[PDB]
């Protein structure tokens, strides 16, 4: 129905990403609730509860049952435009929707850039250390 790139805008798509989520019924951070808050499930070997906002790309692990996903998103990523969107998807105008996807596109590039920064800073540490060791003896 809708192109892959845009599916994450849809709650039902997002819920579907929670294949093996530990926190189910009786918990505040259920998949319905995670999804309503913008989260997609991104589990790794090392962090099997890893969740990402599809819009601002904030990544959060270490979920506890009483965690309210909206308050966690508000806390950890206060500026995420998705938290401002009060209307339901069908009720958005295409202009509104296209505006949001532009912003998401920027958010993605901002994030890729922040990542590359951290990777570069980490290589710089390694190189600095190597040179010290070499200068020492």
């Amino acid at each position: 129905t809708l192109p892959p790139a845009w599916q994450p805008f849809l709650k039902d798509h997002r819920i579907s990403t929670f294949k093996n989520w530990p926190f189910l019924e009786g918990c505040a951070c259920t998949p319905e609730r995670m999804a309503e808050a913008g989260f997609i499930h991104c589990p790794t070997e090392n962090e099997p509860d890893l969740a990402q906002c599809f819009f601002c790309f904030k990544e959060l692990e270490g979920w506890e049952p009483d965690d309210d996903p909206i308050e966690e998103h508000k806390k950890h990523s206060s500026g995420c435009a998705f938290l401002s969107v009060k209307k339901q998807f069908e009720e958005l105008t295409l202009g509104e929707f296209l505006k949001l996807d532009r912003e998401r596109a920027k958010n993605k590039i901002a994030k890729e850039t922040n990542n590359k920064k951290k990777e570069f800073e980490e290589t710089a540490k390694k190189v600095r250390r190597a040179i010290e060791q070499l200068a020492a003896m």
Binding site: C29, L50, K58, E59, L60, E61, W63, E64, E72, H76
Partner: peptide
């Protein structure tokens, strides 16, 4: 919860 590390 909290911010992914590493």
């Amino acid at each position: 919860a909290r911010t992914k590390q590493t």
